[PDB]
Ligand binder design. Structure first.
Ligand SMILES: CCCCCCCCCCCCCCCCCC(=O)OC[C@H](COP(=O)([O-])OCC(O)COP(=O)([O-])OC[C@@H](COC(=O)CCCCCCCCCCCCCCCCC)OC(=O)CCCCCCCCCCCCCCCCC)OC(=O)CCCCCCCCCCCCCCCCC
Ligand code: HEM
Lengths: 430, 55
């Protein structure tokens, strides 16, 4: 059961007696979308300061494990431990992250962390193609709007930061009205609330800055061509649904219909996905996957693919977009029936895995928007209630003759112009 | 001329030729576009055009 109390800070807890671990954490409603192009990467630097050697050493001496996660809409700082020592994690979180920040922002520590983060971002930008392609897709989809800033930070901006930027961001965003205290695993809600009440655990006053511009989607493309690479990596997307939309689960199911494909695994060549019937003959791709990502203001629905067949890219894109076209007009009931159970198993593993850190992140990110956490059972009935008419109604609105965003790198010379791709979003025979 | 001057034998064979030659030009244009396809069109800058192509 999920129990949430608004006394003090918003305290959420999900109790699981079977687990042998307990996680206690703080989730902030600010993310990479709350920063600007001149201090971009301040959140990643804060994360790596919390994860620095001295802080991690003092934590691990007591027997605790530290996790930090940076995203568009939230920042997560989690302390995981054994069930008997769940009170010690609160003490470490109070003493280190909240009460005092002078020790963590010393000159030498800041310089070392800055040099390590610069090295990491430099390695990412050159030797991680499928993920940086998705980052550029975000950066070109939401350009000149908060949601397009990369979460790690750019190489040029990360140099200009000083400790003053970090402390300014901490003053502006680490607030009581922006925070949720989350408890996961083998702990009780009453015990957690009592433990918080015994201490003060006050973060700050409130009134975080309000953004003047809301995120917007622009049809656009960016091409980063490099002929010294062996493949071509391509990510393509349209505007999707945000969190708290009525069509959220319909979006995830429509994504699940096409699924993912790996050419080298024997089993995934026999899937009921009809798209493979066009792909398999000439080995058009090595792998693809479909995504329905949702944020607070907007979302992305699309796919990502990698291939060595540098002379047949347009055929791959054409067949994929013709499979997308089929959703509006001629989706069949068996497709939806398979999609329901595939999605239920897909959602089942996500929310019911052994690791409590994923549960903590999900619960903290959920209560910061909805105000409450949807149960597993009520999720299934909405999934089971989906019909063919709903899928057709959603697809006729979100992907029929709509603008797209594209991002590719590698031997993308075979990738045709924008308009030729944009015309594939309709059939013209219907 | 088909004779000693321009008379009936001349015009009557000038027309039957006039109907034939356009079918020869149409065949030479096919051979004309075959030699255009091996290397492609040129550009006003007079330099290589293999760096920036559109369909
Ligand atoms: C020079 C002209 C070059 C035009 C090239 C072009 O349109 O290519 C687009 C496109 C490029 O091919 P593709 O999209 O890679 O593959 C074919 C599509 O799957 C094709 O699939 P589709 O479903 O996207 O389009 C099928 C198309 C097929 O059209 C026909 O069969 C006709 O159906 C129609 O166009 C039906 C409407 C026809 C209305 C005609 C109005 C009266 C004249 O080819 C077509 O869609 C063919 C359209 C041809 C229309 C007639 C052209 C004039 C004929 C004289
Ligand atoms: C019915 C007659 C003809 C047709 C349909 C025709 C058609 C074409 C076409 C479509 C091209 C490629 C597009 C272009 O360069 O603008 C071309 C190129 C060319 N044609 Fe013709 N052509 C004809 C007659 C001629 C004649 C009479 C000459 C020369 C006396 C000629 C010389 C050329 C040359 C040099 C090019 C290459 C131009 C370039 O690539 O920059 N063509 N022709």
């Amino acid at each position: 059961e999920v129990t949430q109390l608004s006394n003090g800070i918003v305290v959420a807890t999900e109790h699981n007696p079977s687990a042998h671990t307990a996680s206690v954490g703080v989730v902030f409603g600010s993310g990479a979308a709350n920063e600007n192009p001149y201090n971009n990467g301040v959140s990643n630097l804060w994360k790596n300061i919390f994860l620095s050697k001295e802080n991690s050493a003092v934590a691990a001496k007591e027997g605790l494990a530290l996790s930090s996660n940076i995203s568009r809409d939230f920042q997560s700082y989690i302390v995981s431990s054994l069930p008997g020592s769940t009170d010690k994690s609160l003490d470490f979180l109070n003493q280190s992250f909240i009460q005092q920040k002078a020790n963590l922002l010393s000159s030498s520590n800041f310089e070392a962390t800055k040099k390590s983060v610069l090295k990491q971002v430099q390695d990412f930008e050159e030797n991680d193609h499928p993920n940086r392609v998705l980052e550029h897709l975000h950066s070109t989809a939401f350009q000149n709007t908060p949601l397009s800033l990369p979460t790690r930070g750019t190489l040029e901006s990360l140099e200009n930061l000083v400790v003053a930027d970090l402390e300014s961001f901490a003053n502006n965003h680490f607030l009581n009205s922006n925070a949720v205290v989350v408890g996961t695993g083998n702990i009780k809600h009453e015990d957690l609330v009592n433990s918080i009440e015994s201490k003060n655990l006050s973060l700050q006053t409130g009134t975080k800055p309000v953004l003047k511009k809301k995120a917007a989607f622009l049809g656009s493309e960016v091409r980063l061509r490099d002929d010294t690479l062996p493949k071509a990596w391509i990510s393509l997307a349209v505007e999707g649904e945000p969190v708290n939309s009525p069509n959220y689960f319909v979006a995830k199911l429509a994504a699940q219909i096409f699924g993912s494909y790996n050419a080298f695994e024997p089993a995934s060549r026999l899937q009921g996905i009809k798209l493979l019937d066009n792909i398999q003959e000439y080995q058009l791709c090595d792998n693809f996957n479909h995504f329905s990502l949702s944020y607070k203001d907007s979302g992305l629905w699309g796919f990502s693919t990698a291939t060595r067949n540098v002379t047949m890219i347009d055929d791959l894109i054409h067949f994929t977009l013709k499979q997308w076209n089929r959703l509006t007009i001629s989706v069949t009931d068996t497709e939806v029936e398979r999609a329901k159970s595939l999605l239920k198993l897909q959602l089942g593993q996500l929310y019911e895995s052994g690791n409590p850190v994923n549960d903590a992140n999900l619960l903290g990110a959920e209560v910061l928007i909805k105000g409450s956490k949807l149960s597993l059972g009520e999720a299934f009935k909405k999934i089971d209630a989906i019909t063919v008419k709903d899928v057709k109604a959603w697809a006729g609105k979100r992907l029929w003759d709509q603008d797209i965003a594209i991002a590719g790198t590698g031997q993308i010379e075979g990738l045709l112009d924008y308009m030729r791709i944009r015309s594939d979003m309709s059939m013209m025979r219907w | 001329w088909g004779g000693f001057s321009v008379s009936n034998p001349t015009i009557q064979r000038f027309f039957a030729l006039h109907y034939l030659v356009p079918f020869i030009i149409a065949a030479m244009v096919i051979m004309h576009l075959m030699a255009l396809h091996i290397h492609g069109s040129s550009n006003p800058l007079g330099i290589t055009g293999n760096l920036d192509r559109i369909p």
